[PDB]
Symmetry: D2
Subunit: 504 residues, 4 copies
């Protein structure tokens, strides 16, 4: 509304409540703190849209049981289709990780002490303060004397003092408590591990068997890595979405070809901020969100967004700012990892991301955003593109309560979301996978129609539209006499009709 | 357009890029001796005329009834092909509170020379009303001595001759010529700064407006409007029988500019009547008033006409001056909905060349509009509304830009749906399909509306009817060269018959 | 101040007086109506800044006398250095003109009649309704059956029906009265003539001898044409400004290379509107003005701006609009031709351009114009460029009465003018030619300091700044207590303007 | 800032593009046990500390006098080389109307575990002020029972523990534990929504402020400012002797946000004190208040500080969390003049790494600012004035962008000329040359200002005095790597000594 971004900031009002709808999807990592069906039901009620399974840990049998619990909780609400919320399942691959071994349970590494790194498997369960095993058998080929090795989210740091043929002698730079099977980072080293290992192949086939909705591919460095994951999913998994995790320097450098090959991007800030200087992570995050926004592809901001809530019921002020600014940047989804997998306050963490995301969406400077997105998108002969941007423009003109989109594949609703309306996008589908995957796109509130198909086209259209009207009324997005925008076809790939209709 | 700044947009204008076929700006032609025959009117229509203006400053009711007959005979000679038929509107331009001189005396030369520094007596004695000459001039404003004083300036004939009042009398004035010149018969007089007390709607005006209602004219151009109550009185004369006739207030004096907002609110549209305006206010200020008025009409979504002397030299020459070509283009760049020809078509030697030149310039200028900025500004200065038709309109225009559509096709009964699209100034032509002949004629007032009159019978099933009128628009656009099979067009329709229900926008390929 | 151009337009107010200063230069063509010392004096008082001498007509002896009269009229005001106005002298070359012979007097040409065009010089003084001689001797090699030939301001038009050896048989398409020695246009034909004829070389050498300030080079088609003009003016004329007249299709197509080679541009709309379709001239006009504004080179809009005032004391409404829109477009100068060379109301024509230009300058949307000029202009290590744009920003911030610029060559003042401040740019120089050429630049009000040079540089700066203070007070540009911007150097000579000061008017 | 849109500007951010040497955002470090020794303060200064914050919520006048002495000793250890000397400001942060609990009892564990649903009695009986435990909790707000009601929430220890009042008494409250946790001694208590009637300026605060004046502090961070009259009270206490001390109002409750405008008018600057603010208002609204206040301070040209938990994890860890890296960067991108460290430097294990991290992030964020849009908007929202100083400042900032200058050099007495430059947010560092030590330290409050203290005697020739100080600035910039010989800088000077005469801008090559 204000004519400048500065005036817009000056008018932000803490006493102005936001609208009901929350447009940014929330991705929760499942683990011991959130694995029970009972807790999952509350997670869903608190706002979880996507359950993420971290395949860096756990057996297939452990993950099959998590998936089972997630679906039990999700389907416990299916008896009321107007209130049912689809919940997607994401498989986050291990990828080319480096891990330490088992502590012979922690030991205290002291700054200045010597610590020897061994590849001898006779020590893989006998790590202590003098000797440390790790599973990267080629480490001696890629690090030099003077190299830095980081352990456990980059908190422990070691300096290589001597390099043998199959061992390293290091000095502890930043010490502290060292546990078992901790992650290792070698920034600057040309780590030669494969993008898709044999474990990754087994995990990906398991995801197809288990009917997952998306894959979060760790440590993607180039387009050929994405093509490899895509080849493994094969024809049977061809509709599974591949989200490439950017988390090293090469992935940032090669981001454009990775984006073109991917269905979406995760800014995987944990590893990313150890691989590049921490003071540069915000630049990469904003670069990648902007480029994904410009391309109309989903982008996830992830890792440590509410980290202190693993142990505290309230977040720090930096965490509140970080969630809000991710939404203001343009992130389609935000994510929780330890805060929901292992923390003491998993439901409070979900509710806080819901609350902050909703406040941040109300603070977006839509006047400039809508202008620049349209200026940066080319002209096209696609009738669905023109109808989508026309519908969004109409939605700003009448401050509609929603844009209702009927969609089989999701494509129609994605095209609308790319132009970032303020109003929620109620995407009506009969395809359950479409409904689960639509959570990746900002603004899309998927609803799963279960009424049988009508033989007459016009009748089946009116049925799904009335379904959306009832969902919107039930959720409090709008009320009788409000005005909504409705996008339909006139005959998949034929969305070309916009109607401005009052809610009955 | 596409450059990120207006300055770069200017730098990229290319005389070698042809414009599109469609011409969006309406052309209003004043009919007179040079254009009155059915034959010539047929060529005027072919050349681009959209509205025939009848100037009631001259002519009897018999005379104007015959002009209207000939306009309609020429217009309906094209009706046998509904695809190519062009509606032609009829406009009545009132005389209003004009001041005119008398006739030059029989003896002597046809015109008298008023020489700088000479004395000239102005009389109201009717014994001189047909014996005007270089010593004594009669005029028909019987109260003129009451509203002028010594030192007052009096202008005669398009402001070209100027007098200064040296002595005031009971029923005369003694003046000194300042700007001399040749004086003919029955010339217009202006008293800038004087409080002229003639009514906005005279007894003659009432009879003319009542005549216009009976003859079924489409619009009235109301001369010398100074305030909203002037407009209301015109509206009251037109009454219930003429309630659908559009009132265009002519702004031609300082008070009309001063009270412009209330006049615009009461009016259906505005004419910037630059002839009288440039005499009532300093000539160097007219462009300011023009740009202010076009801007405010654009903001309000009401039609605005730029009028008078746009191609003046073409009264005697077959090509216009460079100033005239620039004037026509800048009126369109300003945002005028219509442009107008007066003497160029009513009396000049090249009426068809004048119409053709306005059609050519307007089309080039429309291609030069910086739509990127204009569309953004119109949206920002337009309020949010709970009106579904308004949301649909702006949504259709945005979609029209996104796919570079060949047209926006709008089914409309009253015209309103199409006018709401026109207010947002799409590049593409707006084909307004109506079965209402008056709607089709009045639609010429709005930039970009190309009205087509469907004469097919109403199909029993609404959906079938709609598709009939859409396909009619498709045939018209293909025939006029606006688009071809496989192009994308925008189509706006209602959800039920009647006015007020336009809520549906479709992006469809042309068959 | 409005946030949108649309709202800016809506707020234009006919009752708001403009400031006193008029920033757009007025160029007047001198001719029979305006040649006398007595009239030239009134032309200067009415606002004429540049006297244009059209070398399509007249002998060197005739033009030498014109120049003497201009300088007599101009120096008649030198008595008072604070009110003295410099007046430049412009030579407008004949160029590759095509002219008909002598009728030997006018004939009528009827539509549909036959007219024969001959190169036979026996008929050169025997033009009539049947036979017409023109001086372009290769015309048959460039025209084709069916081509259009335009005579006399494009008002008569002929279509070639038969093409011979030294002959053309035409049909009269647009008739009318035909006098002697009228101009011919062959739009679409690839005319062969030199851009610099031998007569042009003698005329340019004459201009150097007469100390003219600028050359208006007719029918410039390419950069090498401009190079050839520069070569002829030579070392002796190296400071004469060369303005290329764009008036054919080739000049528009090759505008960029011509602008780069030129000191400035004239949009010569008369010939241009016959060479290209009349409805396209406004596009060429705004293109060239925009490109000249972007390059920071002067651009003149010319021809038929107030044409009806050749015979009438007031202009038409389209002529009022044309002058104003030229200024709104961004033209640095506007020009009068027949209106002052030969018409009945030369002083009224000048006064009207002065009045319209001032009203138009007050209506410019400076908020957007200053934003876009900066965006399009490069980052530079040149200190005077940075100082100039800093001075313009400062002038907008404090709504200053003027920007005062001391300049030897003009360049420092030209750099300010490119950023288009609202405030007048008082350019103080001791170089009289600098003072005359500065009229080419929108906003520059040049003043000629005649005081001797003070031994102390610092005192000589203050003296020249105090001179501008007195000029601005006398002309009513500002009053004591107003704030102005002052631009100066740090050491004497050209190329050191790096100092901006905000100071009260004493 | 070169892309035509903010979105493309984002798309072009390049992690491999190194930033300029200069860091423009001031860093304020809270001093405490971790950072109080002279040896550590010297390393704090080298790491980037610009302002030392003394937290008067804790410690005696003796303690704070010694802190001030050590800060001055470390700062003046660099004074031998005036080219490299960095001024360091001293800030006094008042206790204000704090509410705190008592000491945990000596018996049992050091902290007591409060369990969800347990009963906890709050008492005002002083016999318990050092005997708090899991059943009884003393606090020091003797009027608490008069401002809370049954149902009210009471928060303890950074809002981490929450209690609901279930029963009221004359000197006690019975509460139920809502959010349990480990309770230590002398923790902060918040009563959001309650009408706490503690004075803005207690007698203790008055003694602290008077001690601040006597110890020559540079600025005061006034806690819990709710209204302009609170600010006027601080200013009156500082009095004539303290009239040059800058008052920074800390906004940390709902009423201070509500009355922000009148507070900002009365204050020299603002601190967004997010610690208490995020307990007094919902945590999810803090970012809205932060961005509003930063925007309104930027619009007003007054310094704004973003404070609290910016690098909180670094109290215990040598690297920050990803959210902490993003928070610091976004504070700078919002427009914060300074950023602050609290426990990170006052008591943490990694004070030097925390300072260095803020310096590294702020420098990267400053290179990412979209100056193209920022400079346009700051100019559009700023008034036209006859103030010649203000016109000179915006002109130098425009010139700095035009030639990509290495610095803007500003000679200033009071600092104001350099403040006026900083308000328009140049990319180039502002080297503010002053002989007033207090001006130099206070200049750290303003984004972009690099203060340097000239220790040369005044030259009798004004022109020679200017030149001496400008060349000092040249040598500073070369030593610090802000520019080299042949680079171009902007120089602002006045036309006579004293404040208010800045009116000269020069573009000069670096000698
Ligand atoms: O030569 C000229 O000035 C013209 O043709 O307009
Ligand atoms: O006082 C403070 O600094 C706070 O509460 O954030
Ligand atoms: K993983
Ligand atoms: K010439
Ligand atoms: Mg009139
Ligand atoms: Mg010419």
């Amino acid at each position: 509304m204000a004519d400048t971004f500065l005036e817009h900031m000056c008018r932000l009002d803490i006493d102005e409540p936001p609208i009901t709808a929350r447009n940014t999807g929330i991705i929760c990592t499942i683990g011991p703190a959130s694995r029970s069906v009972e807790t999952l039901k509350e997670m869903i009620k608190s706002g979880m849209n996507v359950a993420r399974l971290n395949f860096s840990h756990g057996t297939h049998e452990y993950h099959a049981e998590t998936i089972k619990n997630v679906r039990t909780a999700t389907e416990s609400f299916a008896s009321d289709p107007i209130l049912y919320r689809p919940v997607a399942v994401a498989l986050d691959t291990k990828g080319p990780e480096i891990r330490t071994g088992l502590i012979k349970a922690e030991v205290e590494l002291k700054k200045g002490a010597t610590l020897k790194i061994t590849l001898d498997n006779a020590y893989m369960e006998k790590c202590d303060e003098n000797i440390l095993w790790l599973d990267y058998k080629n480490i001696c080929k890629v690090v030099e004397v003077g190299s830095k090795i980081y352990v456990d989210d980059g908190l422990i740091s070691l300096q290589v003092k001597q390099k043998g043929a199959d061992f390293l002698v290091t000095e502890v730079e930043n010490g502290g408590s060292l546990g078992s099977k901790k992650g290792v980072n070698l920034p600057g080293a040309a780590v030669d591990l494969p993008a898709v290992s044999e474990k990754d192949i087994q995990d990906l086939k398991f995801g197809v068997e288990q009917d997952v909705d998306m894959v979060f591919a760790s440590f993607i460095r180039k387009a050929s890595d994405v093509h490899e994951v895509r080849k493994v999913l094969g024809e049977k998994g061809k509709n599974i979405k591949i989200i490439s995790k950017i988390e090293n320097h090469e992935g940032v450098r090669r981001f454009d070809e990775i984006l073109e090959a991917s269905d979406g991007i995760m800014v995987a800030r944990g590893d990313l901020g150890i691989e590049i200087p921490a003071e540069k992570v915000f630049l990469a995050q904003k670069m990648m969100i902007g480029r994904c926004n410009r391309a109309g592809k989903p982008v996830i901001c992830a890792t440590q967004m509410l980290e202190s809530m693993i142990k505290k019921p309230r977040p720090t002020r930096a965490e509140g700012s970080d969630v809000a600014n991710a939404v203001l940047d343009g992130a389609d989804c935000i994510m929780l990892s330890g805060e929901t997998a292992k923390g003491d306050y998993p439901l409070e963490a979900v509710r806080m991301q819901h609350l902050i995301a909703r406040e941040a969406e109300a603070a977006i400077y839509h006047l400039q955003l809508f202008e620049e997105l349209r200026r940066l998108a080319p002209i096209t002969s696609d009738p669905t593109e023109a109808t989508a941007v026309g519908a969004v423009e109409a939605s700003f003109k009448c401050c509609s309560g929603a844009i209702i989109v009927l969609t089989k594949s999701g494509r129609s609703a994605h095209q609308v979301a790319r132009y970032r309306p303020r109003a929620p996008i109620i995407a009506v589908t009969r395809n359950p996978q479409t409904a689960r995957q639509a959570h990746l796109y900002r603004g899309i509130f998927p609803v799963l129609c279960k009424d049988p198909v009508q033989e007459a086209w016009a009748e089946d259209v009116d049925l799904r539209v009335n379904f959306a009207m009832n969902v919107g009324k039930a959720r409090g997005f709008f009320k009788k006499g409000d005005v909504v925008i409705v996008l339909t076809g006139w005959r998949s790939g034929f969305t070309n009709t916009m109607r401005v209709v009052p809610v009955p």
